[PDB]
Write a protein that binds this ligand. Structure first.
Ligand SMILES: O=C(O)CCCCCC(=O)O
Length: 239
């Protein structure tokens, strides 16, 4: 008997915060209390609690590494190199980089979902190409434990969330992911794949730059099951 808890908050019409937790009824209040207090300030908040029908547990099996470079250019070139080791060929991967660099949303600014890409035409397969695909319905099977472990190991709370997200993205047949934050104060991002693991890369963008986002690399041959798994399948993740 599990429940999905999905929170979103705004201030002056602009999104300020969001989170999902998947927990037993006995933890339902704890999760709702955590998400209620998450935003610093807000005008409006919606919390959507939904009982889970089907779900699957998966064990986390990615290896984490971290690399630091002197410049966004050095960092982005290294991201391209490590994508290359996931079978992506250098050309597609470098298109992903400028998209997030130049501005992922066509009409300008940041999408709040991911770019889809085939590993060949390098074109954006996402439906609403101004919002993109949002991966949802995933969580750490024991978030409090995992968060303690990874924070002690030196990672941040953003790592904790980003890890669980990619491992679902990859479990759903995304082959590799490119991501950095749109927060202008957080310049660590990552490249991710079933072979390269979770490769954290720092300065993927200049401080003060407010353009971020994700790009998922996928087989257009498979796009149907992936969007299904990304947006509808319910996955807990244990260590
Ligand atoms: O593991 C990290 O520290 C990198 C997480 C990238 C930031 C994800 C985001 O805020 O969109």
């Amino acid at each position: 008997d599990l429940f999905s808890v999905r929170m979103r908050a705004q201030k002056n019409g602009k999104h300020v915060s969001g989170a999902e937790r998947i927990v037993k009824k006995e933890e339902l209040e704890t999760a709702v209390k955590e998400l209620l207090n998450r935003p610093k300030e807000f005008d409006f908040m919606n919390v959507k609690v939904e009982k889970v029908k089907d779900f699957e547990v998966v064990k986390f099996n990615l290896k984490i590494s971290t690399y630091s470079f002197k410049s966004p250019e050095e960092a982005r070139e290294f991201a391209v190199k490590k994508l290359t080791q996931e079978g992506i060929k250098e050309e597609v991967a470098k298109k992903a980089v400028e998209i997030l660099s130049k501005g992922a949303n066509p009409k300008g600014g940041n999408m709040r979902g991911a770019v889809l890409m085939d590993i060949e035409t390098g074109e954006r397969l996402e439906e609403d190409k101004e919002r993109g695909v949002r991966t949802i319905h995933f969580d750490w099977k024991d978030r409090k434990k995992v968060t303690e472990k990874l924070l002690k190991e030196g990672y941040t709370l953003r790592t904790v969330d980003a890890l669980a997200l990619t491992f679902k993205n990859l479990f759903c047949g995304v082959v590799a992911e490119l991501c950095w934050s749109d927060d202008p104060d957080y310049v660590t991002g990552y490249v991710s794949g079933k072979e390269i693991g979770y490769v954290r890369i720092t300065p993927l963008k200049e401080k003060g730059d407010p353009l971020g986002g994700r790009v998922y690399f996928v087989s257009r041959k498979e796009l149907s099951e992936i969007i299904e798994c990304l947006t509808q399948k319910v996955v807990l993740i244990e260590l």
